[PDB]
Amino acid sequence: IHMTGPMCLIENTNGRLMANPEALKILSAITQPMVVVAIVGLYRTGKSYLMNKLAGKKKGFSLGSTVQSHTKGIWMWCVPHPKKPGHILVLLDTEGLGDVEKGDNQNDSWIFALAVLLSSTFVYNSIGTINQQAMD
Amino acid sequence: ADGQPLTPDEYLTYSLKLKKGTSQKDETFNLPRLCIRKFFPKKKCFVFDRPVHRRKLAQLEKLQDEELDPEFVQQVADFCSYIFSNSKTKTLSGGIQVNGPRLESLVLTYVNAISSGDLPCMENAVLALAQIENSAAVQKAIAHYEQQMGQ
Amino acid sequence: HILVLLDTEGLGDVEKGDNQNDSWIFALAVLLSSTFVYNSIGTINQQAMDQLYYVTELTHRIRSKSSPDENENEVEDSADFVSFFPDFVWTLRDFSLDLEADGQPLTPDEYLTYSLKLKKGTSQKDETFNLPRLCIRKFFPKKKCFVFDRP
Amino acid sequence: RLESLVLTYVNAISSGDLPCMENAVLALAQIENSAAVQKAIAHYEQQMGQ
Numbered sequence: 001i002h003m004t005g006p007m008c009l010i011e012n013t014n015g016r017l018m019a020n021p022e023a024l025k026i027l028s029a030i031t032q033p034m035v036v037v038a039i040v041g042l043y044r045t046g047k048s049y050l051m052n053k054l055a056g057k058k059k060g061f062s063l064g065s066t067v068q069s070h071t072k073g074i075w076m077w078c079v080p081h082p083k084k085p086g087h088i089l090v091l092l093d094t095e096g097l098g099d100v101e102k103g104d105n106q107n108d109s110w111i112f113a114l115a116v117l118l119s120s121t122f123v124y125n126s127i128g129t130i131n132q133q134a135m136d
Numbered sequence: 137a138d139g140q141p142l143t144p145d146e147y148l149t150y151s152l153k154l155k156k157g158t159s160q161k162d163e164t165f166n167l168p169r170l171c172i173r174k175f176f177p178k179k180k181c182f183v184f185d186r187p188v189h190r191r192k193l194a195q196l197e198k199l200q201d202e203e204l205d206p207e208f209v210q211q212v213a214d215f216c217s218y219i220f221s222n223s224k225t226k227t228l229s230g231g232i233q234v235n236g237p238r239l240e241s242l243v244l245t246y247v248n249a250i251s252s253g254d255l256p257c258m259e260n261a262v263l264a265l266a267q268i269e270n271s272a273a274v275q276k277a278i279a280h281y282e283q284q285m286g287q
Numbered sequence: 288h289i290l291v292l293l294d295t296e297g298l299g300d301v302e303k304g305d306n307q308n309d310s311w312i313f314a315l316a317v318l319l320s321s322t323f324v325y326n327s328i329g330t331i332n333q334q335a336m337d338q339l340y341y342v343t344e345l346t347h348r349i350r351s352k353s354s355p356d357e358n359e360n361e362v363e364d365s366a367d368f369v370s371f372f373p374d375f376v377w378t379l380r381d382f383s384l385d386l387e388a389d390g391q392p393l394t395p396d397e398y399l400t401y402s403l404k405l406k407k408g409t410s411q412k413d414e415t416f417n418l419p420r421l422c423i424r425k426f427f428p429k430k431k432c433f434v435f436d437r438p
Numbered sequence: 439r440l441e442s443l444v445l446t447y448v449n450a451i452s453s454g455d456l457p458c459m460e461n462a463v464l465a466l467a468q469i470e471n472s473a474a475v476q477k478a479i480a481h482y483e484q485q486m487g488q
C-alpha cells in the first residue's frame with residue numbers, strides 16, 4: 001500500500017530533469033488524499049535528517065556528513081498519515097541549493113519551483129539566522 | 137529585538153515586515169516582502185538548537201536521544217507535531233482534492249513545462265550588467281552614427 | 288610597521304533598507320586592504336562565491352573609472368589592476384563536515400581549490416560555472432583557507 | 439596615502455562610479471518582455487510570409 005522506504009521521484013539525468021516511472025506508478029496507485037510536505041534549503045543543512053523525523057524513522061532519506069552534496073534530484077516517500085485515517089503523508093526530500101561542484105546552477109531554481117508546486121506544506125530550511133539572501 | 141524578547145514567529149514576522157513610507161529608499165526592501173506576504177499568508181517559524189556535540193554530528197541518525205541535546209529532541213518533536221496537526225490536504229482549482237494519480241499528473245505537467253523552457257533562469261549579476269550596458273552601447277553608437285550622417 | 292584592522296558591517300541584514308550599501312562596504316574592504324578575510328560558516332556556498340565574483344567585477348570597474356584622472360595611476364606600466372587586489376583568506380567557522388571529496392581526505396586549502404576549480408573544457412554546459420571562478424582565479428591568485436571549530 | 443584612498447573611493451561611490459544592478463521582478467520582466475517582443479515578431483513574420 002505505502003512505501004517502506006523512499007525512492008527517487010525526479011532524477012538529474014545528465015543535466016536534464018527526468019521522472020522515475022517506477023516512483024510515478026507507485027504514486028499513481030495511491031488512492032487516498034495526500035498531505036504533501038516538501039523541504040528546501042541550502043546543501044549540507046540537515047534537510048534529509050529532518051524529513052526522516054517526519055517519517056518517524058531513524059533512517060530513510062540518505063544522510064551523509066562530507067563537504068560534498070549528497071541528495072540529488074527529488075525523492076518521495078509515501079507513508080500513512082500518523083493521525084488521519086485514510087490519508088497519506090508524502091515527504092519530498094530535495095537536492096540542496098548552492099552546491100559549489102554543480103555546473104547546472106539553474107537546476108536549483110527548478111527543484112525549488114517543483115517543491116513549491118507539488119507541496120501543501122513547504123519547509124524552508126536555513127541555518128543560524130534569517131538571511132537577506134534567503135528572503136531574496 | 138530593540139530591547140524586547142521575541143518569539144521565533146515574531147522574529148520571522150519582523151524580518152518579513154514591510155517598511156512604512158512608500159518612498160524610493162524603501163522600494164527594494166519592500167519588493168520581496170510584499171510578494172512573500174501575498175504568496176505565503178500563513179507562516180510559522182521553528183528554532184532548533186545545535187543537535188549534539190560537534191564531533192558526533194556525522195553520526196546523528198545512529199545516536200540515541202540521550203546523546204543528543206535534550207532541547208533539540210524536544211524541538212524536533214514540537215516541529216513534527218505542528219506539521220501533522222496543521223498541514224492540509226493538497227488542493228487544486230474547482231474544489232479538487234489531490235490524490236496519487238492527480239499528484240502524478242502535476243509532476244508530469246510541471247516537469248514537461250520545465251523541459252520545454254517555460255521556467256525563466258536567474259542569470260549571474262555580471263552577465264546581466266553586460267547585457268544591459270552593451271545594449272545601451274549599441275543604441276549610443278547608432279545615435280552617434282545618425283547624428284554624424286544627418287549633419 | 289603598522290597593522291590596520293578593518294571591521295565591517297555584516298552583509299544580509301534583514302532590517303537594512305539600503306541593501307546596496309552592502310556592496311559598497313564590500314567594495315571598500317577590497318579597495319582599502321592588503322589582506323581580505325572572507326568569513327563564512329560551515330561550508331563554501333555558491334552564493335558566497337557569486338557575491339565575491341560580482342563585487343570584484345564592480346570593484347575593478349570602479350577602479351578603472353578613477354585611474355585616468357589619477358596621477359598616482361601613472362607611476363607603473365606593466366602591472367594589471369588585478370595585481371593590487373588583496374590576498375584572499377577564506378575562513379570557515381563552526382566547521383564540522385568531513386574534509387573528504389570523492390573518497391580522498393583533503394586539506395582546507397584543497398577544499399577551497401576544489402570549490403573554486405574551473406571545470407575543464409570550453410562547452411556551454413561549463414560557461415556559467417566557470418565565469419565566477421575565472422574571475423576569482425584572475426583577481427585572487429594567492430588564496431588561503433582556514434577552518435575553525437565551534438568555539 | 440591610506441587617508442587619500444579612503445577619501446578617493448568614498449567620493450567615487452558617492453558620485454555613482456560603482457554600478458548598481460536593479461532587483462529581481464523588474465530584471466525578470468526586462469528579460470521575459472524582451473523575449474516576448476521577439477516571439478511576437480517571429481509569429482508576425484511567419485503569418486505574413488505564408
Ligand SMILES: Nc1nc2c(ncn2[C@@H]2O[C@H](COP(=O)(O)OP(=O)(O)O)[C@@H](O)[C@H]2O)c(=O)[nH]1
Binds near residue numbers: 046184
Ligand atoms: N549542525 C547540524 N548538523 C546536523 C543537523 N542535523 C543533521 N546534521 C548533520 O549534518 C550532516 C548533513 O545532513 P543531511 O541530512 O545530509 O543534510 P542535507 O544535505 O540538507 O540533506 C549530517 O552529517 C547530519 O548528521 C543539525 O540540526 N545541525
Ligand SMILES: [Mg+2]
Binds near residue numbers: 047048064070071
Ligand atoms: Mg541529504
